[PDB]
């Protein structure tokens, strides 16, 4: 059998409440619902009792009640609410049934009470399934819990004016919450129904509008088992980065989801829609799985008057509620057949009020006010049931009085001024509160306000345990962790949500948002000033970490050469010294000082505007030996000393003039070689000119040596002549030997200074030996 809640009244008001929750495949609905079914039913009863006793609202007509059960199902709700349309269809079809009794008031002994107005449809699917049947018979509907997005349009569900905001504002609040915690990688869970699908689609829209993506979207059916929920949690666990889980499920739906998550030891930061709410039966048995869960609820306040009325309730006195007895049995785990729980009272047990309670209460008042508008529209003179109230049309009432409600909310707190009104589309005001499941007490759990959304989200992390800095970093769900932007650049695939980052080329730093910046040419990639650093230490190439030895030995040899040359020229009083001219000593001293200056200049001189001077210096250093060879071949060829010195000076001048003419002091240098770890600050202007001048000087030296080698025997001079001839010959041989290695090693610049120092040191040692041979002979 079925139970019908009937309360006599002048104008009966329809009602559809899910007193019974979802049942198994055996029956349509099994266990009774405590928070959703009983509390809202008693709230509607209290609202009707208070309105019937209110002299300022419907003083003459009495508001009856015809309340039915939905069993949290669509087909059951439809077959139950079929009586709502039967009551009108009987009168509609009895128009021609006028023979015996009368013309227009034909009665058959059983006339169902006409349902002028009906409120119900707490579930969105039940709401849309019943709204069509209600509008088919011109019956207005006012909801209190269904927030489906497909009920906003008036083309299909024209006779539907809910007192709650739609899913648009809820999705906005969810998106703002997920953006506040920097949650990017998101997983969603839905249910088989309009509510779940529309909520999920709106959530994906607002997430794509907030640079948030969702990998997989899961859905559940109506008839479900623990195994399917465990499989859903396992599929959610397939991606470890999915720390957050969006839920658009029901109350018992979320309860079984939490049970399955706890059975699988799965940890998630659950974020859900208004289906979760502040219910304790949903989190019952799954306290650990619900730890740190964010829940959004519709904005409302508890009612003190309804709480006192609800607590003072007993099955004996409350005989008007057919389900109250079985609710008492299910709540106190007793049976009235044994007559054992008669002494139990609801006052001792703590009572938790459903958040949406006042909602339906307001709805009732709204409907009542609509009725009051009728009393001010057709029969304003009389107070009792007038003849104009017999035909009730839903179109006029809905389009002129239901949608034009604006009144102070009943049982509202004195601190705030809440006003119930209907918007342009017959929805409610968009405002939500946020709860977080935390262990506020020692062992108990409760819900605490941690923020609210009303045309803008406001949250505080002080009341959120996991978001507080004391607990550490908050649990974040991202597909890819933020890598080091200093040397790792992220690629931009065909997405906007996820990305992968790899280290770019070492010689380029990451400045742009797409590709590592090139840092120009000749600049080292770093982060020193703005984007990278510059190392101008290439020109300053002093160094000599391991080359200090050879250069120090060269300077020591040059100093010893200066010393012995000074000692020799100071010994000019010797008869052997008087046999030679004074010009040879002067030019040899000049050459030794020159090579000493070249040794001292190869390390300390820079490379900015010194390369041309260095080329001229090498030219003069080679011209020293050139003049030596010229005077050697001129003395053996035959006032005379003056002519020889003039010829040597002219040759040196021609050599340096040619060396200066062949080189072109222009502009332009190499930017950087293939390798980019070090920059090059070099005189990359003209080296072909340098090597050509060296080759020409070597050729003239070879010609002079070939001319001089003919007169190997010099009878004018003593055994020093053959000695200096052999010295010139071996210097020419060592020069032609060092020429190819000098031409080949030009690739490496660091070796250039070393080989130049080695060459000048060898030349200096050769000249030192040549000059010390007469000194050793006269020693």
């Amino acid at each position: 059998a079925k139970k019908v809640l009937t309360l006599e009244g002048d104008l009966v008001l329809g009602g559809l409440f899910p007193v019974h929750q979802k049942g198994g495949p055996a029956e349509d609905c099994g266990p009774v619902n405590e928070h959703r079914g009983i509390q809202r039913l008693e709230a509607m009863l209290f609202a009707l009792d208070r309105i019937n006793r209110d002299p300022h609202l419907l003083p003459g007509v009495r508001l009856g009640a015809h309340i039915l059960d939905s069993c949290s199902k669509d087909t059951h709700a439809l077959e139950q609410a079929l009586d709502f349309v039967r009551a009108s269809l009987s009168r509609g079809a009895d128009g021609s049934r006028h023979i015996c009794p009368d013309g227009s008031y034909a009665t058959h002994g059983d006339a169902p009470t006409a349902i002028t107005g009906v409120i119900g449809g707490s579930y969105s699917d039940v709401s849309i399934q019943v709204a069509n049947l209600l509008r088919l018979f011109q019956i207005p509907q006012i909801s209190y819990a269904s927030t489906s997005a497909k009920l906003s349009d008036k083309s299909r569900y024209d006779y539907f004016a809910r007192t709650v905001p739609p899913d648009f504002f809820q999705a906005k609040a969810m998106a703002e919450i997920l953006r506040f915690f920097n949650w990017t990688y998101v997983s969603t869970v839905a249910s088989e129904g309009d509510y779940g699908e529309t909520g999920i689609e709106a959530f994906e829209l607002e997430a794509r509008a907030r640079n948030i993506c969702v990998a997989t979207s899961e859905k559940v059916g109506r008839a479900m088992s623990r195994a399917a929920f465990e499989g859903v949690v396992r599929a959610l666990l397939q991606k470890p980065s999915a720390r957050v889980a969006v839920l658009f499920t029901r109350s018992e739906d979320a309860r079984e989801l939490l049970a399955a998550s706890q059975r699988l030891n799965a940890s998630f930061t659950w974020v859900a829609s208004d289906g979760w709410g502040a219910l304790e039966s949903v989190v019952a048995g799954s306290e650990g799985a619900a730890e740190g869960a964010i829940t959004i609820e519709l904005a409302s306040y508890p009612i003190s008057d309804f709480a006192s009325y609800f607590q003072s309730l007993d099955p004996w006195n409350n005989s008007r509620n057919p389900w109250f007895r079985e609710f008492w049995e299910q709540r106190f785990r007793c049976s009235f057949r044994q007559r054992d729980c008669a002494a139990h009272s609801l006052r001792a047990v703590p009572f938790e009020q459903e958040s949406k309670i006042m909602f339906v209460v307001n709805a009732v008042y709204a409907m009542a006010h609509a009725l009051h508008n009728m009393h001010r529209a057709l029969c304003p003179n009389t107070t009792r049931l007038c003849d104009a109230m017999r035909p009730v049309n839903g179109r006029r009432l809905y389009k002129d009085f239901v949608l034009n409600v604006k009144f102070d909310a009943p049982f509202r707190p004195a601190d705030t001024h809440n006003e119930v009104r209907f918007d342009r589309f017959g929805d409610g005001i968009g405002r939500y509160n946020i709860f977080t499941y935390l262990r506020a007490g020692s062992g108990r759990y409760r819900y605490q306000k941690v923020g609210y959304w009303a045309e803008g989200l406001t949250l505080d992390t002080s009341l959120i345990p996991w978001a507080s800095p004391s607990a550490g970093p908050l649990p974040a769900s991202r597909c890819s962790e933020p890598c080091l932007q200093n040397e790792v650049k992220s690629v931009q695939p065909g997405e906007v949500c996820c990305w992968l980052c790899i280290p770019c080329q070492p010689y380029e730093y990451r400045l742009d948002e797409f590709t590592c910046a090139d840092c120009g040419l000749g600049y080292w990639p770093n982060a020193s000033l703005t984007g990278c650093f510059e190392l101008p230490q290439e020109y300053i190439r002093w160094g000599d970490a391991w080359a200090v030895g050879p250069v120090t030995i060269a300077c020591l040899g040059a100093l010893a050469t200066l010393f012995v040359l000074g000692v020799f020229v100071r010994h000019n009083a010797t008869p052997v010294v008087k046999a030679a001219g004074r010009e040879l000593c002067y030019i040899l001293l000049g050459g030794v000082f020159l090579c000493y200056c070249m040794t001292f200049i190869f390390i300390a001189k820079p490379s900015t505007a010194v390369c041309t001077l260095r080329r001229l210096g090498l030219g003069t250093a080679f011209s020293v030996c050139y003049s030596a060879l010229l005077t050697k071949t001129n003395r053996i060829a035959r006032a005379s000393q003056v002519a020889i010195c003039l010829a040597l000076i002219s040759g040196q001048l021609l050599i340096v003039v040619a060396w200066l003419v062949v080189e072109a002091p222009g502009t332009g240098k190499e930017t950087a070689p293939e390798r980019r770890e070090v920059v090059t600050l070099r005189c990359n202007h003209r080296d072909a000119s340098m090597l050509g001048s060296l080759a020409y000087n070597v050729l003239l030296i070879a010609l002079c040596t070939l001319y001089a080698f003919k007169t190997r025997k010099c009878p004018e001079n003593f055994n020093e002549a053959k000695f200096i001839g052999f010295t010139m010959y071996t210097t020419c041989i060592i020069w032609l030997a060092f020429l190819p290695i000098f031409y080949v090693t030009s690739s490496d610049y660091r070796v250039q200074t070393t080989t130049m120092c080695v060459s000048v040191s060898l030349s200096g040692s050769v000249v030192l030996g040549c000059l010390f041979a007469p000194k050793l002979h006269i020693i």
Epitope: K219, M224, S225, A227, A228, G231, V232
Partner: nanobody, 118 residues
């Protein structure tokens, strides 16, 4: 969607051998999980046996060792054997099948009453 068909009920003596068979049509549906539930009119449902379809199975609180169940995928059928039954097994047993086609829906079956005497 699909539905489940059961057979093998009736009245048996307490402590006797009872076997229940539950089958269905696959219809290209990837069946991931199948199990058995027990409930009473107006009450809640409780799982008594379930197979993960990967060699792993789970049972109820009073069925740790007994109440063995086996599934064959050639016909997609589940068979559970009953050996020790108390008079508290009057509640009807139901079998469920889990399929994943964008819904993760669970298909149920009819009800076969099982009765036990003294």
């Amino acid at each position: 969607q699909v539905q489940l068909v059961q057979s093998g009920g009736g009245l048996v003596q307490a402590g006797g051998s009872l076997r229940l068979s539950c089958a269905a049509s696959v219809r290209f549906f990837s069946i991931n999980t199948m199990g058995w539930y027990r409930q009473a009119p107006g009450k809640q449902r409780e799982l008594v046996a379930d197979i993960t379809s990967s060699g792993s199975t789970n049972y109820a609180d009073s069925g740790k060792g007994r109440f063995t169940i086996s599934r064959d995928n050639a016909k997609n059928t589940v068979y559970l054997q009953m050996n020790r039954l108390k008079p508290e097994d009057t509640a009807v047993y139901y079998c469920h099948a889990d399929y994943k086609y964008t819904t993760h829906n669970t298909a149920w079956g009819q009800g076969t009453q099982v009765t036990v005497s003294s």
